[PDB]
Amino acid sequence: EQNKDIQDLLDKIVFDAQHGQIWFDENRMLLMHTSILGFLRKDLYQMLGLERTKRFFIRCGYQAGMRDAEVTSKLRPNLNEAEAFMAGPQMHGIRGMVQVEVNELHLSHDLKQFYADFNWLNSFEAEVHLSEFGASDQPACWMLLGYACGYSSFVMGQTIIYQETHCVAQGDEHCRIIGKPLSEWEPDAVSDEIIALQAELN
Amino acid sequence: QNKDIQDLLDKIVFDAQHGQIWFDENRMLLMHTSILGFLRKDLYQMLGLERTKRFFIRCGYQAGMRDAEVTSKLRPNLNEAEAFMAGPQMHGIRGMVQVEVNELHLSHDLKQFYADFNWLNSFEAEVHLSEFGASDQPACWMLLGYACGYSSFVMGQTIIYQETHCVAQGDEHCRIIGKPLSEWENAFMSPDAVSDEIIAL
Ligand SMILES: [Zn+2]
Numbered sequence: 001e002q003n004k005d006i007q008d009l010l011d012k013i014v015f016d017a018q019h020g021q022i023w024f025d026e027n028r029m030l031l032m033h034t035s036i037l038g039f040l041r042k043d044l045y046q047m048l049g050l051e052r053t054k055r056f057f058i059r060c061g062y063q064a065g066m067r068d069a070e071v072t073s074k075l076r077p078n079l080n081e082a083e084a085f086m087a088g089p090q091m092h093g094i095r096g097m098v099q100v101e102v103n104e105l106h107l108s109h110d111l112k113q114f115y116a117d118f119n120w121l122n123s124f125e126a127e128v129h130l131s132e133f134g135a136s137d138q139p140a141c142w143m144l145l146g147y148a149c150g151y152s153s154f155v156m157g158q159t160i161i162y163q164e165t166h167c168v169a170q171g172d173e174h175c176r177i178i179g180k181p182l183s184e185w186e187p188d189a190v191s192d193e194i195i196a197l198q199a200e201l202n
Numbered sequence: 203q204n205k206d207i208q209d210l211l212d213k214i215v216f217d218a219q220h221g222q223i224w225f226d227e228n229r230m231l232l233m234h235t236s237i238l239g240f241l242r243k244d245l246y247q248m249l250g251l252e253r254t255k256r257f258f259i260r261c262g263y264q265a266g267m268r269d270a271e272v273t274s275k276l277r278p279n280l281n282e283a284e285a286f287m288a289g290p291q292m293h294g295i296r297g298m299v300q301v302e303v304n305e306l307h308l309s310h311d312l313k314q315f316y317a318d319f320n321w322l323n324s325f326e327a328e329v330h331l332s333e334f335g336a337s338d339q340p341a342c343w344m345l346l347g348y349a350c351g352y353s354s355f356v357m358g359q360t361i362i363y364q365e366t367h368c369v370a371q372g373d374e375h376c377r378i379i380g381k382p383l384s385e386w387e388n389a390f391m392s393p394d395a396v397s398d399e400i401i402a403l
């Protein structure tokens with residue numbers, strides 16, 4: 001009854017337990033344990049840097065986001081920018097990664113203008129990061145955040161960057177992000193700006 | 203419809219509104235296979251193939267051991283074999299691989315195990331092809347770790363598999379034989395010991 005606006009998305013998800021397949025349109029998926037992600041994160045951190053690990057989860061996310069936007073692209077042409085864009089935040093729910101809640105969204109392809117402010121609720125990433133690390137000193141939601149930047153950047157034809165303003169990892173009640181075109185912040189590893197920003201805004 | 207998997211599908215809930223996916227206690231993620239391809243490409247070039255391969259078995263092993271924990275006391279009114287099938291079934295629910303049983307005999311009590319399965323539509327195989335193309339040797343490492351991790355735990359001893367044909371080598375499907383450790387004609391902390399073992403291919 002109540003995934004009225006999700007439904008068109010669910011309609012592309014095919015479970016096929018009997019053949020070891022799960023599909024979103026043309027692409028496969030895997031139902032994965034979060035605590036297994038928690039291990040992959042700590043093991044990576046142990047092998048590489050905080051920095052190289054960080055960088056991986058973000059680039060990862062950027063990818064997932066771009067692919068979902070490819071997918072959900074030819075999918076709501078009846079609708080407008082805002083309602084189509086939403087597919088993104090909805091997919092993050094669908095994949096059980098995070099609950100997106102919109103404080104503010106203003107966008108327009110042709111104006112090359114974007115500003116998003118959302119609350120992330122129930123982030124897995126923050127939850128797993130606490131087990132393996134405890135109270136962090138920076139935000140933890142790298143993957144979610146890469147995906148955020150990715151999805152968005154696909155949708156507008158320009159690079160959209162997010163800052164995680166508050167994070168459950170850091171003790172904040174919910175997590176929160178803000179997203180604006182790269183330049184409105186005063187070779188496509190956009191991965192490096194994200195880290196440089198959370199740095200050069202102490 | 204397909205009633206062999208129900209006691210599993212049941213323990214799964216999709217709360218898309220609050221962005222949680224649920225397996226009993228455990229919380230789950232529906233993910234692109236891209237994160238695993240990427241990880242494969244990055245690791246391949248930062249560390250050896252040996253190192254990348256090992257890491258992947260280790261990861262596969264942790265998930266095998268988890269489902270093993272979770273499905274543990276779930277099928278007490280069936281026998282060892284149908285109980286055990288939980289792992290192979292889970293691997294398919296998780297959309298990683300279809301397991302088609304060629305042969306299976308197990309006794310926890312007698313310390314006995316022999317599994318010979320076919321793997322079909324292996325996701326790992328797929329990933330390796332579109333990152334590295336034809337392998338020299340079987341490539342379904344994550345999958346193999348799981349096999350090893352799951353079996354091992356149920357059995358309460360060290361069960362090691364070998365991929366014997368792999369889509370990654372042009373075979374039509376992949377194949378695997380799992381025996382106990384001592385039944386191989388070649389010779390905690392121990393979770394790392396075991397990954398070290400299933401790495402001698
Ligand atoms: Zn967070």
Ligand SMILES: [Zn+2]
Binds near residue numbers: 341367
């Ligand atoms: Zn294979």
